[PDB]
Enzyme design. Structure first.
Site, PDB file in Angstrom:
ATOM      1  N   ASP A   1       0.822  -1.209   0.000  1.00 11.16           N
ATOM      2  CA  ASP A   1       0.000   0.000   0.000  1.00 11.16           C
ATOM      3  C   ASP A   1       0.862   1.268   0.000  1.00 11.16           C
ATOM      4  O   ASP A   1       1.354   1.678   1.050  1.00 11.16           O
ATOM      5  CB  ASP A   1      -0.919  -0.006   1.228  1.00 11.16           C
TER       6      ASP A   1
ATOM      7  N   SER B   1      -0.602  15.675 -11.958  1.00 15.34           N
ATOM      8  CA  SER B   1      -0.843  15.319 -13.349  1.00 15.34           C
ATOM      9  C   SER B   1      -1.073  16.578 -14.167  1.00 15.34           C
ATOM     10  O   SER B   1      -1.583  17.566 -13.664  1.00 15.34           O
ATOM     11  CB  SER B   1      -2.039  14.364 -13.450  1.00 15.34           C
TER      12      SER B   1
END
Length: 330
Positions: A35, A199
């Site tokens: 994770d 992004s």
């Protein structure tokens, strides 16, 4: 040193991925959910409340000659999906794919929430976010990666998750045969303890690319792709019959649909998520309403590049003095 381990979807939907991890002496192999959005290595154990164990493999520290109780240490964690676990702490030897750390904090669960109990395939979590998020008290502990880093050939790990197929976590090296083209690297903020990056935009299907900054986290422990409501609406508007359902808890779409791809930007580079990766199947057994793999982050407080996004790429988690993230197509 290096390590390399195969990671395997837990079910036909790629809801999560499990990776075998050797703990203790002799080794006890548990299948852990790696994770990158948390920083505790915790396991089902001989100390877990019996009624809360249902099929998981447990770590038994009393059977490990290298286990030592970390005196006074406790841990307690709550995850974004509302699940939680807590317990005490041992140090022991932990190996992943041939890479060994001695004295790793292994957090033994005394209690786990129902979602963990109900998932027989996940024996615990191995956190790969920054150690500043580790919950052990009163002495915070380091992640497996943090402990291994100085010994690694290069201070990196990579996630190469498969679509409906196994993939690979590598530690300490970049497998240049595992991706196409070049790796584009992008800046990371560690201020929230995550692999947080920005992004450069998105496209829906064959549509034009929208240049816009989207801050979010690279999180292998989250199944879906969670993005701003504007972006998510633009995606689902291209699917006839798709709608946001408050009763179901997100966007659903007719199972008869063919889904468009979704592209996200990494610098000047582009990662394309095929439409099929966005299908999470019937909302309930036999339903013709299917659950979408792109959902709104509104009310989460952060955008999450979960498995839906990451499995479309070869992803480098660069833990150099100034961390960065790399993405390549594959």
């Amino acid at each position: 040193s290096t390590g390399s381990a195969t990671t395997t979807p837990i079910d036909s939907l790629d809801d999560a991925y499990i990776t075998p991890v050797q703990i203790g002496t002799p080794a006890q192999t548990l299948n852990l959910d790696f994770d990158t959005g948390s920083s505790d290595l915790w396991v089902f154990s001989s100390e877990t409340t019996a009624s809360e164990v249902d099929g998981q493999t447990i770590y038994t520290p009393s059977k490990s000659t290298t286990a030592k109780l970390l005196s006074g240490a406790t841990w307690s964690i709550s995850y974004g999906d509302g699940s939680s676990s807590s317990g005490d702490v041992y140090t022991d030897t932990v190996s992943v794919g041939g890479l060994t750390v001695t004295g790793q904090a292994v957090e033994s669960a005394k209690k786990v929430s129902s979602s963990f109990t109900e998932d027989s395939t996940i024996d615990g979590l191995l956190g790969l976010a920054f150690s500043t998020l580790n919950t052990v008290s009163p002495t915070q502990q380091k992640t497996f990666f943090d402990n291994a880093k100085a010994s690694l050939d290069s201070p990196v790990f990579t996630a190469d998750l498969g679509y409906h197929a196994p993939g690979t976590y590598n530690f300490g090296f970049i497998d240049t045969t595992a991706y196409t083209g070049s790796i584009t690297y992008t800046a990371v903020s560690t201020k929230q303890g995550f692999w947080e990056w920005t992004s450069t935009g998105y496209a829906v299907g064959s549509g034009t690319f929208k240049s816009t900054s989207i801050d979010g986290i690279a999180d292998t422990g989250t199944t879906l792709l969670y993005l701003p409501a504007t972006v998510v609406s633009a995606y689902w508007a291209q699917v006839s019959g798709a709608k946001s359902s408050s009763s179901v808890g997100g966007y659903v779409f007719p199972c008869s649909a063919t889904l468009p791809s979704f592209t996200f930007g990494v610098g000047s580079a582009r990662i394309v998520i095929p439409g099929d990766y966005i299908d999470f199947g019937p909302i309930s057994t036999g339903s013709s309403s299917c659950f979408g793999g792109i959902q709104s982050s509104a009310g989460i407080g952060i955008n999450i590049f979960g498995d839906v996004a990451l499995k479309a790429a070869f992803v480098v988690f660069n833990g150099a003095t100034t961390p960065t993230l790399g993405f390549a197509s594959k």
